[PDB]
Design a protein around this motif. Structure first.
Motif, PDB file in Angstrom:
ATOM      1  N   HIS A 136       0.726  -1.160  -0.248  1.00 54.82           N
ATOM      2  CA  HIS A 136       0.190  -0.326   0.094  1.00 54.82           C
ATOM      3  C   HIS A 136       1.045   1.303   0.356  1.00 54.82           C
ATOM      4  CE1 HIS A 136      -3.300  -3.219   1.590  1.00 54.82           C
ATOM      5  NE2 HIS A 136      -3.701  -2.069   0.497  1.00 54.82           N
ATOM      6  N   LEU A 137       2.147   1.188   1.030  1.00 53.59           N
ATOM      7  CA  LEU A 137       2.764   1.895   1.311  1.00 53.59           C
ATOM      8  C   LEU A 137       3.604   2.822  -0.343  1.00 53.59           C
ATOM      9  CD1 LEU A 137       3.886   1.797   4.721  1.00 53.59           C
ATOM     10  CD2 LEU A 137       2.564   3.294   3.477  1.00 53.59           C
ATOM     11  N   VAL A 138       4.023   1.792  -1.045  1.00 55.25           N
ATOM     12  CA  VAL A 138       5.227   1.873  -1.975  1.00 55.25           C
ATOM     13  C   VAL A 138       4.009   2.310  -3.033  1.00 55.25           C
ATOM     14  CG1 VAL A 138       5.909   0.831  -3.720  1.00 55.25           C
ATOM     15  CG2 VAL A 138       6.637   0.066  -1.525  1.00 55.25           C
ATOM     16  N   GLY A 139       3.167   1.691  -2.854  1.00 48.46           N
ATOM     17  CA  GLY A 139       1.461   1.962  -3.613  1.00 48.46           C
ATOM     18  C   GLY A 139       1.436   4.131  -3.959  1.00 48.46           C
ATOM     19  N   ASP A 140       0.814   3.905  -2.794  1.00 48.59           N
ATOM     20  CA  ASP A 140       1.038   5.699  -2.910  1.00 48.59           C
ATOM     21  C   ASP A 140       1.613   6.196  -3.478  1.00 48.59           C
ATOM     22  OD1 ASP A 140      -0.846   4.428  -0.739  1.00 48.59           O
ATOM     23  OD2 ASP A 140      -0.012   5.169   0.995  1.00 48.59           O
ATOM     24  N   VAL A 141       3.351   6.398  -3.055  1.00 52.16           N
ATOM     25  CA  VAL A 141       4.554   6.479  -3.353  1.00 52.16           C
ATOM     26  C   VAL A 141       4.323   6.054  -4.879  1.00 52.16           C
ATOM     27  CG1 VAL A 141       6.722   6.822  -3.766  1.00 52.16           C
ATOM     28  CG2 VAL A 141       6.182   6.268  -1.483  1.00 52.16           C
ATOM     29  N   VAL A 142       4.013   5.939  -5.495  1.00 52.67           N
ATOM     30  CA  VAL A 142       4.112   5.890  -7.373  1.00 52.67           C
ATOM     31  C   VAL A 142       2.966   6.628  -7.399  1.00 52.67           C
ATOM     32  CG1 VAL A 142       3.634   4.054  -9.344  1.00 52.67           C
ATOM     33  CG2 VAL A 142       5.109   3.076  -6.932  1.00 52.67           C
ATOM     34  N   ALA A 143       1.762   6.469  -6.803  1.00 53.71           N
ATOM     35  CA  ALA A 143       0.960   7.367  -7.278  1.00 53.71           C
ATOM     36  C   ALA A 143       0.960   8.554  -7.242  1.00 53.71           C
ATOM     37  CB  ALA A 143      -0.811   7.307  -6.670  1.00 53.71           C
ATOM     38  N   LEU A 144       1.530   8.991  -6.244  1.00 49.92           N
ATOM     39  CA  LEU A 144       2.398  10.344  -5.839  1.00 49.92           C
ATOM     40  C   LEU A 144       3.665  10.645  -7.186  1.00 49.92           C
ATOM     41  CD1 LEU A 144       2.608  12.819  -3.933  1.00 49.92           C
ATOM     42  CD2 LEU A 144       3.996  11.122  -2.950  1.00 49.92           C
ATOM     43  N   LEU A 145       4.579   9.715  -7.446  1.00 46.17           N
ATOM     44  CA  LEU A 145       5.260  10.089  -8.241  1.00 46.17           C
ATOM     45  C   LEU A 145       4.482  10.884  -9.527  1.00 46.17           C
ATOM     46  CD1 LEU A 145       8.462   8.292  -7.985  1.00 46.17           C
ATOM     47  CD2 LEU A 145       8.148   9.997  -7.598  1.00 46.17           C
ATOM     48  N   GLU A 146       4.128  10.001 -10.505  1.00 45.02           N
ATOM     49  CA  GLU A 146       2.529   9.929 -11.547  1.00 45.02           C
ATOM     50  C   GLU A 146       2.056  11.277 -11.457  1.00 45.02           C
ATOM     51  OE1 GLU A 146       0.635   6.432 -11.382  1.00 45.02           O
ATOM     52  OE2 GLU A 146       0.120   6.375 -13.156  1.00 45.02           O
ATOM     53  N   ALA A 147       1.765  11.929 -10.133  1.00 50.76           N
ATOM     54  CA  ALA A 147       0.842  12.577 -10.248  1.00 50.76           C
ATOM     55  C   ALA A 147       1.820  14.232  -9.869  1.00 50.76           C
ATOM     56  CB  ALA A 147      -0.432  13.235  -8.510  1.00 50.76           C
ATOM     57  N   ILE A 148       2.684  14.099  -9.632  1.00 53.99           N
ATOM     58  CA  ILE A 148       3.647  15.564  -8.992  1.00 53.99           C
ATOM     59  C   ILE A 148       4.960  15.402 -10.276  1.00 53.99           C
ATOM     60  CG2 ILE A 148       3.052  15.681  -7.008  1.00 53.99           C
ATOM     61  CD1 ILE A 148       6.493  14.962  -6.671  1.00 53.99           C
ATOM     62  N   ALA A 149       5.594  14.072 -10.321  1.00 49.23           N
ATOM     63  CA  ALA A 149       7.055  14.498 -11.066  1.00 49.23           C
ATOM     64  C   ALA A 149       6.490  14.115 -12.349  1.00 49.23           C
ATOM     65  CB  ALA A 149       7.515  12.721 -11.244  1.00 49.23           C
ATOM     66  N   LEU A 150       5.535  13.283 -13.193  1.00 51.68           N
ATOM     67  CA  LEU A 150       4.935  14.200 -14.221  1.00 51.68           C
ATOM     68  C   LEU A 150       5.992  13.777 -15.518  1.00 51.68           C
ATOM     69  CD1 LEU A 150       3.472  17.732 -13.347  1.00 51.68           C
ATOM     70  CD2 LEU A 150       1.551  15.518 -13.886  1.00 51.68           C
ATOM     71  N   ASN A 151       7.085  14.472 -15.946  1.00 53.09           N
ATOM     72  CA  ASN A 151       8.014  14.627 -17.471  1.00 53.09           C
ATOM     73  C   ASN A 151       8.743  13.428 -16.701  1.00 53.09           C
ATOM     74  OD1 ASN A 151       6.784  16.610 -19.470  1.00 53.09           O
ATOM     75  ND2 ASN A 151       7.044  17.507 -17.167  1.00 53.09           N
ATOM     76  N   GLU A 152       9.278  13.812 -15.492  1.00 50.20           N
ATOM     77  CA  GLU A 152      10.847  13.278 -15.046  1.00 50.20           C
ATOM     78  C   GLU A 152      10.547  11.851 -15.220  1.00 50.20           C
ATOM     79  OE1 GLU A 152      12.585  14.942 -12.207  1.00 50.20           O
ATOM     80  OE2 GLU A 152      11.297  16.799 -12.639  1.00 50.20           O
ATOM     81  N   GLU A 153      11.973  11.061 -16.059  1.00 52.58           N
ATOM     82  CA  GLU A 153      11.258   9.703 -16.266  1.00 52.58           C
ATOM     83  C   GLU A 153      11.554   8.926 -14.479  1.00 52.58           C
ATOM     84  OE1 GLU A 153      13.898   7.950 -19.531  1.00 52.58           O
ATOM     85  OE2 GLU A 153      14.661   6.820 -17.561  1.00 52.58           O
ATOM     86  N   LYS A 154      12.407   9.844 -14.334  1.00 58.26           N
ATOM     87  CA  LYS A 154      13.073   9.253 -12.650  1.00 58.26           C
ATOM     88  C   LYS A 154      13.024  10.773 -11.689  1.00 58.26           C
ATOM     89  CE  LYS A 154      15.721   5.596 -14.973  1.00 58.26           C
ATOM     90  NZ  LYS A 154      17.065   4.438 -14.483  1.00 58.26           N
ATOM     91  N   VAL A 155      13.149  10.301 -10.769  1.00 56.16           N
ATOM     92  CA  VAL A 155      13.692  11.028  -9.057  1.00 56.16           C
ATOM     93  C   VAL A 155      14.534  11.211  -8.265  1.00 56.16           C
ATOM     94  CG1 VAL A 155      10.914  12.288  -9.318  1.00 56.16           C
ATOM     95  CG2 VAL A 155      11.946  10.355  -7.536  1.00 56.16           C
ATOM     96  N   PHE A 156      15.070  11.523  -7.491  1.00 63.72           N
ATOM     97  CA  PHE A 156      15.867  11.224  -6.856  1.00 63.72           C
ATOM     98  C   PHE A 156      15.220  10.916  -4.940  1.00 63.72           C
ATOM     99  CE2 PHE A 156      18.534  14.103  -9.417  1.00 63.72           C
ATOM    100  CZ  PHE A 156      19.695  13.030  -9.134  1.00 63.72           C
ATOM    101  N   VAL A 157      15.498   9.754  -4.327  1.00 62.43           N
ATOM    102  CA  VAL A 157      14.673  10.008  -3.347  1.00 62.43           C
ATOM    103  C   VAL A 157      15.798   9.897  -2.334  1.00 62.43           C
ATOM    104  CG1 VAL A 157      13.784   7.917  -1.983  1.00 62.43           C
ATOM    105  CG2 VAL A 157      13.204   8.816  -4.213  1.00 62.43           C
ATOM    106  N   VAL A 158      14.911  10.541  -1.101  1.00 60.07           N
ATOM    107  CA  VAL A 158      15.554  10.668  -0.056  1.00 60.07           C
ATOM    108  C   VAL A 158      15.052   9.565   1.248  1.00 60.07           C
ATOM    109  CG1 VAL A 158      17.168  11.692   1.552  1.00 60.07           C
ATOM    110  CG2 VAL A 158      16.825  12.219  -0.789  1.00 60.07           C
ATOM    111  N   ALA A 159      15.827   9.240   1.865  1.00 56.88           N
ATOM    112  CA  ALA A 159      14.695   9.270   3.004  1.00 56.88           C
ATOM    113  C   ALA A 159      14.826   8.455   3.938  1.00 56.88           C
ATOM    114  CB  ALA A 159      13.420   7.601   2.428  1.00 56.88           C
ATOM    115  N   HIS A 160      14.252   8.616   5.669  1.00 55.89           N
ATOM    116  CA  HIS A 160      14.757   7.999   6.491  1.00 55.89           C
ATOM    117  C   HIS A 160      13.833   7.328   7.349  1.00 55.89           C
ATOM    118  CE1 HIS A 160      15.600   8.909  11.201  1.00 55.89           C
ATOM    119  NE2 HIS A 160      16.021   8.727  10.973  1.00 55.89           N
ATOM    120  N   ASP A 161      14.017   5.974   8.074  1.00 57.71           N
ATOM    121  CA  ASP A 161      13.937   4.831   9.128  1.00 57.71           C
ATOM    122  C   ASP A 161      12.254   3.940   8.574  1.00 57.71           C
ATOM    123  OD1 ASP A 161      12.953   4.547  11.943  1.00 57.71           O
ATOM    124  OD2 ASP A 161      11.184   5.070  11.210  1.00 57.71           O
ATOM    125  N   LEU A 162      11.469   4.192   8.793  1.00 56.71           N
ATOM    126  CA  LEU A 162      10.391   2.887   7.762  1.00 56.71           C
ATOM    127  C   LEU A 162      10.195   4.002   6.459  1.00 56.71           C
ATOM    128  CD1 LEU A 162       7.316   2.816  10.156  1.00 56.71           C
ATOM    129  CD2 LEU A 162       9.213   1.171   9.225  1.00 56.71           C
TER     130      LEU A 162
END
Length: 319
Positions: free
Chosen positions: A78-104
């Motif tokens: 579900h969580l990874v699903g959220d991120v993917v949906a989010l990236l479709e919504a806000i990444a739009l063009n960019e084939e790829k983005v940078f990820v920075v993450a902490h803890d969970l």
């Protein structure tokens, strides 16, 4: 200053904090944190021509739409699903983005990179190393076997129980205790004993956290409660079953890993051996060297904001 929007993401109304323009950097917070934990890095990186995006995850702060009564809706998928949906919504063009993450957030990020390496250019993960899936048992059972019922991950399993413990105490005290924690031992929450099992650090060591900054957190959790956050831990048993197809699979994304020397997660048995002695490079073949921050505990994005910020910049500049 920082812009805040609500975006529809995978059936959620997801709160997203935004600053800057340029290539996108998705920031994924941990437990028990918010978009707000990235505050220093968002600014540092926006000023250097990157577009900082930091959501509140499912069950946290202003993001809504996730059923608190059902932990299974907080599984890693579900969580990874959220991120993917989010990236479709806000990444739009960019084939790829940078990820920075902490803890969970790091946990989620590892799985993002396993499931959809096409979406991520490069990754900076803090605190949580890639954990090989143990074909014998899940993490809850594993950690309970070593540390007992009072181990926080165990105490979190039953809905209401830990929420009930915190109720009389209040969000502010609880958050203070956790954010200010520095012992490399795991946290314990023995039944009825509140926060009394957690040792205190010299007040001077937590000067990085300010009354104002703590109040931001306290005020949010006062309104939301801890159920959404804690449900992540509740979903760990199912997560083990669901991640079976990725036994033996490798993360094929260029990665930098940073951890505080006194990080409780760093001191899980076998963690250092795994991290330093080859295992970690085997699972993550494009792992550029590991960084251990001397004198830092778990909350490095906030405790050592410059060191963290700079490491992030120096790494993503390579791409």
């Amino acid at each position: 200053k920082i812009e805040h929007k609500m975006v529809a993401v995978n059936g959620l109304n997801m709160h997203l904090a935004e600053l800057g323009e340029g290539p996108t950097i998705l920031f994924i917070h941990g437990f028990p944190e918010l978009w707000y934990s990235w505050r220093h890095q968002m600014v540092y990186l926006a000023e250097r021509g990157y577009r900082a995006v930091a959501p509140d995850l499912r069950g946290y702060g202003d993001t809504t739409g996730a059923p608190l009564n059902d932990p299974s809706k907080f599984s890693i998928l579900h969580l990874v699903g959220d991120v993917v949906a989010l990236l479709e919504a806000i990444a739009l063009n960019e084939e790829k983005v940078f990820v920075v993450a902490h803890d969970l957030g790091a946990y989620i990020a590892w799985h993002l990179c396993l499931f959809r390496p096409d979406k991520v250019k490069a990754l900076v993960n803090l605190s949580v190393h890639f954990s090989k899936r143990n074909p014998k048992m899940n993490k809850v059972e594993g950690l309970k076997a070593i540390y007992g019922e009072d181990h926080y991950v165990s105490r979190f399993q039953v809905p209401g129980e830990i929420e009930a413990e915190f109720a009389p105490i209040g969000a502010k005290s609880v958050l203070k205790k956790i954010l200010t924690y520095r012992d490399p031992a795991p946290l314990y929450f023995p039944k009825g004993k509140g926060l009394e099992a957690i040792p205190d650090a010299p007040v001077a060591l937590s000067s990085w956290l300010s009354e104002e900054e703590l109040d931001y957190y306290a005020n949010k959790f006062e309104q939301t409660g801890f159920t959404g956050a804690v449900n992540y831990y509740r979903a760990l048993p199912i997560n083990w079953e669901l991640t079976a197809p990725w036994t033996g699979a490798q993360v094929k994304v260029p990665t930098k890993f940073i951890v505080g020397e006194f990080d409780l997660v760093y001191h899980i048995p076998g963690a250092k051996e795994y991290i330093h002695n080859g295992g970690f490079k085997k699972d993550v073949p494009l792992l550029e060297e590991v960084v251990v921050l001397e004198g830092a505990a778990h909350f490095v994005s906030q405790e050592r904001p410059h060191e963290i910020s700079k490491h992030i910049y120096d790494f993503i500049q390579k791409f």
